[model samples]
Target: GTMARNDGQGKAAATFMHISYNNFITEVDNLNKRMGDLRDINGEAGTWVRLLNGSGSADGGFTDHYTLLQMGADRKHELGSMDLFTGVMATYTDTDASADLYSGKTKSWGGGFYASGLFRSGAYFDVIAKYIHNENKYDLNFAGAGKQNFRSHSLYAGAEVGYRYHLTDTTFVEPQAELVWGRLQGQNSVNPLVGRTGVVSGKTFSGKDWSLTARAGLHYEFDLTDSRKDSRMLYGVGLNARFGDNTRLGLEVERSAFGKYNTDDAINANIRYSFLE
Candidate 1:
């Protein structure tokens, strides 16, 4: 059966990003509270935007923005607080060209919530676990000569476990792995319409399968917290290289996607800022 997914390849990249905002906020904070202490019940977040061309649709292509909120506490020794936290993410992909074709929003979208914890073995390394459930709706267009639109929703349950290896007192490297298993459900008569109504004519493939996922990468963090001596602001940078099976590669000027048969690659880079109040 022809892959029922987009074959556009690894044409997506995170060309530019900024992490300095993370540190900038921490230094500017005059609060007499936590110093260099990542709050236990605090929220964390970031965004991602693709720096490449359209994947399936023309004109507007693929443009999406995502943000995540997280909460957790520092892990101590083999036993410490369970440090439970939950996160939710939202993604908006622009599909202006296919809006009319699909008879619905061309954008593929969803949000997920997950609970995770941290475990530290030493000052330089830590492990984490997270259970997540994500649901997504994809707006798709029929191939060939027809402008038929269809929608599919994917419900997935997954987990991740990885170790954070600190390279230095202020720097660290990490490698994490995760797996997701679930099914995709096409709403209404969309599945039949796609296989029959499209110009392709007799495309007959409709079934959900199990999906496994993994990620491995290295991260270097810079300490931008203010000095009690100078009382200056913090400015941090996280240089990370991430790679996943059937997903994008985390590297400089190059990203990639690994599939069951072939792999496609792209490039990504970012600079960010941090703060605390």
Candidate 2:
């Protein structure tokens, strides 16, 4: 056992190696998948958004939920396929900077369209474009501070490309690259920290309204059983960090315009269950 294999055409060797690989990958995948579900049931690359506010204190947190629908069509003659998707998202945030400093709550809603396709060479591409509207209500306790409300909106977009390499007829690995960009629109709001406006007479202290970021990752897809039509398990892991300006809600008060925030240098693995086409 563990030493050598004797089989016609080295088929036993191949099968043993495949079993070892699957066992290791499956273990790691389950570990990562469990963690991901505990963190966010959406899993990695799922449709959702997270916005962090304030100094990232345990006293403050944000959460969001998304609902999506996907449709696709394929042509067997060319080994090509195309997909169209749409979804809605809802977000809620509550931050406590102390009753004396500042505190606020925000509610937001978003919806968008996504499209993707696969090429004959096992290459694929996808893009997502969405819009979000936000309503913020805050309370200031400091002197000269006042209770106020504001409304704003922004646009978010990104794309990804990758190629799938088959390890076997039923097992394959995919490496991917992604880029994301965001832009804020409308007037800036006041900072919750200092109770100062994003700008005063064309002067500004804090507030970033736009940003861009890049990421790379690997994914694994395989059948859980020998049957080709058996349900499939998807696994992936990656590291993602952001660059560029931050999205600002007030002076020195910012959040990630994209789904990533408080997720710098973050590494994650995820497992998804679905039918194999």
Candidate 3:
């Protein structure tokens, strides 16, 4: 659950998104949350992103996070693709009157990274790749367990390639494919309630899982300027939509001897704007 609504590709610009409040932790508590963010692009030095995310499904708490990233602005740097970034974060979640859901409103620090790229200017091509890592710790209670807490870490990576054919100068129809895989691990002491144990220690059990993801979508774009300077000052807007498969390879992976769960389907839409120099 890492999001900051900004891309620090280091270009003196920023992007943001605002999420309204709501509670729908789904399949369990009625948890709703709202989020906002901003990113600063500081030339070639690097990019920094800040975010404010809060939730109110249970009790109500908010967290602030900042991340710094390094991405050179060569456009062709690494063939139009470069490594994203991960940063240390601090979270203050709500616990107090909440149920076991919260582990007692504690603070956690972690880091992650991303890699993304687009190709062929709204025509016949689609490609993307990414990887992420996060480390989390909790300080709270679990009823029978006397003041229990734990740390969770995860690794995820994926790749997708597809194609888009233009319907017009600024309109295109795209169909693409994608793949993603990830795993989650928990570390604990004195036999925790969830997850498996360590193999070397023989005192821990771990619940490892993996998922495969796929998707396809359409795209559109338009011009927003009438003059040379206007074109330089105003970047046009683009729209995109995509759907995907987000489960395991099959049931064998979901119900592995290690333990597994099947994820549902997902769809997403995106809008983009750019500045030309």
Candidate 4:
């Protein structure tokens, strides 16, 4: 079995806002080894979640959750390794606006195809392309004395590429970049204002379908046990930037064991037999 989890929080200076992101993953391979043989096929699934609150307004926050499934294969070469995989993702989101002005929710579904390769020389590359169709629903109130409700659809497609550097046998670093292109295909409601007293429109609240981001991270692994089959702790941190937009930072820690027993387990066993079954 393979499992990993990560979480991060940061502040963007440009917007003076806070952002948080988290990810959880678990996958099983077909061998006694954790990651399995390089020449084996495998399947996996995971979830990604995010939160944003920077506008200092009740309506200026956003939250999202995505679930995904994957299938893939890996090849071991004399010099390096390569893998190809594809998966699907389901997304849900909520946007908060001045409750007196506006609020909205979205449901989206999409799929992605990806390929990655690594060389023994400490060089690596990864690329992925994805497409999503979204349904957005909103509630709006106007000064004219009536409330409006509407919905629309959106399409998104994007790709990412990154390179990894293996500084040492137990440590590595990577820099990556991504580009996304998207558009709200249809409109279903009249433009709404940001507040009852302001002429500012909710249209500004809508994000551009297209975006670019740069990221960098580093990780170090601690080895324990002779076979090392069940003894490693990996930890890392990352920084991200959306050009001309906001910045995000992240950090993560992980540990895995296959069938190894430790002192903690021994103590627990003594306690269990000493007490009740």
Estimated TM-score for each candidate: 0.37, 0.38, 0.33, 0.38
Residues 1-277, candidate 1, lDDT per residue (tens digit)? 1443233211110100011111111111100011111113222432222222222211223222222222222222223644433334333333222222222223344444444455444222112222222222333334332332334444444444444555545343344333333333432111100000000001112124312112223222122112101111111121222222112111122111221111122222222122122
For model 2, the local distance difference test gives 0.31
Write model 4 residue lDDT over 1-277, tens digit each, in one string.
Answer: 1121111111111111111000100111111011111122222321222222111121233322232232232232333255433333333333322333334443444444444444444343444444434444444333232333333443333333344454554234444443333333332211111100101001111135312222222222221111122222222222221222222122221222221311111000000000111
Tell me the tens digit of each residue's lDDT in model 2 across 65-158.
2121222221212222433222333333232222223445545555555545456466655566656555555554333335646555555555
Give the poorly placed runs of model 2, Cα more than 4 Å off.
Answer: 1-101, 141-143, 188-261, 264-277
The TM-score of candidate 2 is 0.38
Best by lDDT: 2
Model 3: per-residue Cα lDDT over 146-191, one tens digit each? 3434343333333433344555443334443333333434441111
lDDT of 4 at 148: 32
Question: What lDDT does each candidate get?
Answer: 0.25, 0.31, 0.21, 0.26
For model 3 the local lDDT of residue 249 reads 14
Model 3 spans > 4 angstroms off: 1-75, 78-117, 121-143, 188-277
Which ten-residue region of model 3 has the weakest summed lDDT?
29-38
Off by over 4 Å in 4: 1-81, 87-100, 118-121, 145-147, 188-277
